[PDB]
Design a binder for these strands. Sequence first.
DNA 1: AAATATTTATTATCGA
DNA 2: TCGATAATAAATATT
Lengths: 89, 93
Amino acid sequence: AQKPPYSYVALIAMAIRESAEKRLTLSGIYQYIIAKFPFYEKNKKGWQNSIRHNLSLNECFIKVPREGGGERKGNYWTLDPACEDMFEK
Amino acid sequence: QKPPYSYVALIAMAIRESAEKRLTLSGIYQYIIAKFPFYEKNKKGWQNSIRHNLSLNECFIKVPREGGGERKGNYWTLDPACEDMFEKGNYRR
DNA sequence: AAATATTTATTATCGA
DNA sequence: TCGATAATAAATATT
């Protein structure tokens, strides 16, 4: 019972390293973040767009190809082989 | 050829240098160019500086635009006390 | 008209 | 009072 004002930044690449295959999608993001804590909600476009723009400022992300496991838009999103050893932690 | 001039005063001067005084945001730059052309649109560096003046003041108001004026930007105007203050001492050193 | 990602754009924090 | 990192709204491009 307290205020979580800190978890808007590192919730993006988290689902990469918390997982085992390191390429979970927005579906896995949603279901796992929901399964984690009992207050946050996906029924708000505000917080959704907030977490959406949290990915553009820092210049370390990149787009990586994927086949028809859900690809109609195009490639998935992950990190760069350079800013690697700073996101496992 | 950028100006060493007060940027809030730059916005207010652009304001008084018009009749409608409520032009769109995407034209604001052009007007400053009309005075002192230096900057290039590709340079994304010094934008936050002008932003600091645009957002942080106490003589402007924020009012939502009309749905037909659907572009990127809003309209701003001055304050009567700010008007009568700037009308006297606007261009000193 | 509802919800993915390259640019734009208020509140406020730091630093000079 | 002029500049550099973060944290937040509302309107284009993309599927």
